[PDB]
């Protein structure tokens, strides 16, 4: 219908009315997040075996 | 040896089977002996609202059975005084209904109909909620236990304890035997399969089965009925009523001729018998005294139903019967006939009881064509000693013209009943077997050049049959009361044992389980639960730790393992899963509900992108 088509134009104007930063800045910010928090991700910075539930940990709450 | 009811869980399967055939209705169950018995147990002992209704139903039923008018006038008022003043103060009766009832009563006229209006309104009140409360109740579970058995009846010689011979024939011999199941006394008619092929009696033997079948419903006292029919690899077999009194051609030999007063009695019982066959559209065609049998009290029944014939869909025209007792239209080349025939036979037979031979048999002749010629030509010369009212009856029956013969003019059996000859008899009393009988009885290798093919055997494929009301009546009047109590004890004990075991309630309740029950995998017996998307199973202890999904199932077929019918599920992985069942109803239903389950499941998944099988190989 015309309702189904006018719904689209209204939306497509909505999507075009956002503003956009540059992919160079965009990527830069992701890589900043990874580098920053890389110390904490235990799949990259492993922890002691006794502190890891799934390896050698003994005491639990 | 004795009947072992299946467990209550059978309900899950059985109910679905019955519902599919619309057999879970008040009318369908209430009108069955065991259905009825379990129903009234429920209302009398377990639902205070239904009690007086059924009590009152059963009171009216006793009244229906009362012999004579003076007994009824008694019971009629006797009835209206007591229960009625509880029922009018309750569940009232209609004005409309009480109007007719009180109308007859005020005038002191008392038929059996008298209370029929009250019957109908009682049903109206029994078949609503009260029925649906019964379906929910443990007694419908018990009905389902009993019906399961009925529909699993496979008979063999092991089931019967055969005693003495009491009849030879062409294809085999009749015995006397006790069904070990219930201890009911019966007669077994064993036709030998090698004898049948030697005499070509293929339609002849398979005819009887269909004929016995049609006449065995109704609960009639004057025809030798069938309850079961079954066959072994080399023998056919009929379970029939037992009659220990010998046949009327044997007693005619020892007694000589009978009086009018004595012949009347037999004719009465034989007439009602014939009426029963005619109302069900069967012409007997071999009425002679040799085919009439006596029980130990003296009462009689028509027996040999081989030559009998259906006339509903088309009227026969052959020359079937014994030559002394065949109506003129049976003998004539291409003339068709119906119940007309059996009435002419009645004359011929009745005559022979009175004078010792067929009226068309003379000088003790043994020339079939001469005897057939008297039938068509000879006017039947009747004795002088005979009464007038007897002369009335016989020349009516032996009347050559079918349109001029008693029992053919429109009312059938009723024209003969109201003949002058039976003027003294209350015909109800005949049917009640209450008139005193006149006579009380005192206390092979020819077929070895013929082989049984598995083509011949297919002719008797649908031979076996069980007449429901007959089996139900057998059970009712023997083991039913006691076996109910016995399985009541088991079911109570298992529940008491499980209450000690900290009973885990049903695994089926709460979910979307389609149905459930025992089956055997591969033999390993296991309890199954069929769900919309899968079929689980467990062993006697724990919750199901095994299953088969609906999407795996390619086809559900039926196949043989050591001559027992089973289900052959073909799994997608090329594998096969075989299921056995404990009863035919169960086999029929699983097959169905699985075919319905996997087809429904496999389509639903097709829509779902998350559950369907996407491409993999290039």
């Amino acid at each position: 219908s015309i309702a189904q088509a006018r719904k689209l134009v209204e939306q497509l104007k909505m999507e075009a009315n956002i503003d956009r930063i540059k992919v160079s800045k965009a990527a830069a910010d992701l890589m900043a997040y990874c580098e920053a928090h890389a110390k904490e991700d235990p799949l990259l910075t492993p922890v002691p075996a006794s502190e890891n539930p799934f390896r050698e940990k003994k005491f639990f709450c | 040896k004795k009947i072992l009811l299946p467990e209550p869980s059978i309900r899950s399967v059985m109910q679905k089977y019955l519902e599919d055939r619309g057999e879970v209705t008040f009318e369908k169950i209430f009108s069955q002996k065991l259905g009825y018995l379990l129903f009234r147990d429920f209302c009398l002992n377990h639902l205070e609202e239904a009690r007086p209704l059924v009590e009152f139903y059963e009171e009216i039923k006793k009244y229906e059975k009362l012999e004579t008018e003076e007994e009824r006038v008694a019971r009629s008022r006797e009835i209206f005084d007591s229960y009625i003043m509880k029922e009018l103060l309750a569940h009232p009766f209609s004005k409309s209904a009480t109007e007719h009832v009180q109308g007859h009563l005020g005038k002191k006229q008392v038929p059996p109909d008298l209370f029929q209006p009250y019957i109908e309104e009682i049903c109206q009140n029994l078949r609503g909620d009260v029925f649906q409360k019964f379906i929910e109740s443990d007694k419908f579970t018990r009905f389902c236990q009993w019906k399961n058995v009925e529909l699993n009846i496979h008979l063999t010689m092991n089931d019967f304890s055969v005693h003495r011979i009491i009849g030879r024939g062409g294809f085999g011999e009749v015995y006397g035997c006790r069904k070990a199941d219930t201890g009911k006394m019966y007669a077994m008619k064993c036709l030998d399969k090698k004898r049948i092929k030697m005499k070509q009696g293929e339609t002849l033997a398979l005819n009887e089965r269909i004929m016995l079948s049609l006449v065995s419903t109704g609960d009639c006292p004057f025809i030798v009925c069938m309850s079961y029919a079954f066959h072994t690899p080399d023998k056919l077999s009929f379970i029939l009523d037992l009659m220990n009194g010998g046949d009327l051609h044997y007693h005619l030999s020892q007694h000589g001729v009978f009086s009018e007063a004595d012949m009347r009695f037999y004719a009465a019982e034989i007439i009602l018998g014939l009426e029963h066959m005619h109302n069900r559209f069967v012409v007997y065609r071999d009425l002679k005294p040799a085919n009439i049998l006596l029980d130990e009290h003296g009462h009689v029944r028509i027996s040999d139903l081989g030559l009998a014939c259906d006339f509903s869909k088309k009227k026969p025209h052959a020359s079937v019967g014994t030559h002394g007792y065949m109506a003129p239209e049976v003998l004539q080349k291409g003339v068709a006939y119906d119940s007309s025939a059996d009435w002419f036979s009645l004359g011929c037979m009745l005559f022979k009881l009175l004078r010792g031979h067929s009226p068309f048999r003379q000088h003790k002749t043994k020339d079939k064509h001469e005897i057939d010629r008297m039938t068509l030509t000879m006017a039947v010369e009747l004795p002088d000693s005979f009464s007038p009212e007897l002369r009335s009856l016989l020349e009516g029956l032996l009347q050559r013209d079918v349109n001029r013969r008693l029992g053919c003019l429109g009312r059938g059996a009723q024209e003969v009943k109201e003949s002058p000859f039976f003027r003294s008899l209350d015909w109800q009393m005949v049917f009640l077997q209450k008139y005193p009988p006149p006579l009380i009885p005192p206390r092979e290798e020819d077929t070895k050049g013929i082989k049984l093919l598995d083509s011949d055997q297919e002719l008797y494929r649908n031979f076996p049959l069980t007449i429901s009301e007959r089996w139900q009546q057998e059970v009712a009047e023997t083991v039913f009361d006691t076996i109910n109590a016995e399985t009541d004890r088991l079911e109570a004990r298992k529940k008491a044992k499980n209450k000690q075991l900290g009973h885990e309630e049903d695994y089926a309740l709460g979910k979307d389980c389609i149905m459930h029950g025992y089956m055997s995998k591969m033999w390993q017996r296991r309890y199954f639960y069929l769900f919309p998307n899968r079929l689980e199973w467990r062993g006697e202890g724990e919750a199901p730790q095994s299953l088969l999904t609906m999407e795996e199932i390619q086809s559900v077929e039926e196949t043989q393992i050591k001559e027992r019918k089973c289900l052959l599920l073909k799994i997608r992985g090329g594998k096969q899963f075989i299921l056995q069942c404990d009863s035919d109803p169960e086999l029929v239903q699983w097959k169905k509900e699985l075919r319905d389950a996997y087809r429904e499941a496999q389509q639903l998944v097709q829509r779902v992108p998350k559950m369907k099988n996407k491409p993999r190989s290039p």
């Binding site: 015309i2 088509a5 006018r6 689209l8 134009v9 939306q11 497509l12 104007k13 909505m14 999507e15 075009a16 956002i18 956009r20 930063i21 540059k22 992919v23 160079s24 965009a26 990527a27 830069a28 910010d29 992701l30 890589m31 997040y33 990874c34 920053a36 928090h37 890389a38 904490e40 991700d41 235990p42 799949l43 990259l44 539930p53 799934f54 390896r55 639990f60 | 709460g510 979910k511 979307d512 769900f531 919309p532 998307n533 899968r534 689980e536 199901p544 730790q545 095994s546 299953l547 999904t549 639903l604 829509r607 779902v608 992108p609 998350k610 559950m611 996407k614 491409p615 993999r616 290039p618």
Partner: protein, 338 residues
């Protein structure tokens, strides 16, 4: 008049394309070209959770990184204690056709649903201890594909009816509805802040929704086939998609376009599930070839493989504390890897 608005419908589509091209000054793989590779990450399977009697369709970690819920073709939800293999609860459902599940952040409630077209909420600690249903949510006219809590009293469901919806669990009604997709919606993921969420559909597009305001801010096409799964990057300015076309894709919100495509030639089957590690460096993806592949998100290299299921990896999830990855499979087992 019908034509009149279908020209502006593609004039604006082209205004957007060129809008985005003006931002495409470099690529993520170029920017990241400088960083050290993560190197081979050889995660071993540390638990096997055995209980489900058939396929597993959907799994979800609890915030405590210890308990998880799984939903299965065998008609049950099970809540496991990963640390010990123990089952906390075997919940038998009222419909056999489940497809999804979800644990409360609180952990007091789980949710599930399927071809029933209802999102049922279960209360994991009644005033007795017996687990019971606390609410059904009827409203959708299509299968429930996915659902997630915001808090005890708010859930967000997606359906094959082609819509999403935000519920008020107490009243059991829909506060807001998210019409927009033109094909069955398949997965959703909440932004960490919750103010946003994204969805993914069989139309081959994902959409960023405005949870509270109730409308589509952005649409991200690029895939060639049904998008099966979706995941937000921990900082909420980018997300990742899994599809039948055999690729994952990283999309950045502020750049409003595709940044990255993960896809070796040898991988020809579909992605069923996707999740980032705590920092966001690794992108974990489940496949119909029975494997879960670990992708270097920033460099688009394959860092490693989680291989040990006999059938489709149907679902996966990283604990909030990044300690472990869970994979659920059509082989009926979950496995905890690290």
């Amino acid at each position: 008049e019908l034509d009149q608005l279908r020209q502006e419908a593609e004039q604006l589509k082209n205004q957007i394309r060129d809008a985005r091209k003006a931002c495409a000054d470099a690529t993520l793989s170029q920017i990241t070209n400088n960083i050290d590779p993560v190197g081979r990450i050889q995660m071993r399977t540390r638990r096997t959770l055995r209980g489900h009697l058939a396929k597993i369709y959907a799994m979800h970690w609890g915030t405590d990184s210890r308990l998880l819920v799984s939903a299965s073709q065998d008609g049950k939800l099970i809540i496991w204690d990963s640390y010990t293999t123990n089952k906390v609860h075997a919940i038998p459902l009222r419909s056999s056709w489940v497809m999804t599940c979800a644990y409360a952040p609180s952990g007091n409630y789980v949710a599930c649903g399927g071809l029933d077209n209802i999102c049922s909420i279960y209360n994991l600690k009644t005033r007795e201890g017996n687990v019971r249903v606390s609410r059904e949510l009827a409203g959708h006219t299509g299968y429930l594909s996915c659902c997630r809590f915001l808090d005890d009293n708010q859930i967000v469901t997606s359906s094959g009816d082609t819509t999403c919806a935000l519920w008020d669990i107490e009243t059991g009604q829909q506060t807001t509805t998210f019409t927009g997709h033109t094909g069955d919606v398949m997965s959703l993921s909440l932004a960490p802040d919750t103010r946003l969420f994204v969805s993914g559909a069989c139309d081959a597009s994902a959409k960023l929704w405005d949870v509270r305001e109730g409308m589509c801010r952005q649409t991200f096409t690029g895939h060639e086939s049904d998008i099966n799964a979706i995941c937000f990057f921990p900082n909420g300015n980018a997300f990742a998609t899994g599809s039948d076309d055999a690729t994952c894709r990283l999309f950045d919100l502020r750049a409003d376009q595709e940044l990255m495509t993960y896809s070796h030639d040898n991988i020809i089957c579909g992605i069923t599930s996707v999740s980032f590690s705590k920092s966001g460096r690794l992108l974990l993806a489940g496949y119909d070839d029975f494997n879960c592949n670990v992708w270097d998100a920033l460099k688009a290299d394959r860092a490693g493989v989680l291989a040990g299921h006999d059938n489709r990896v149907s679902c996966l999830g990283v604990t909030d504390d990044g300690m472990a990855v869970a994979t659920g499979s059509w082989d009926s087992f979950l496995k905890i890897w690290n």
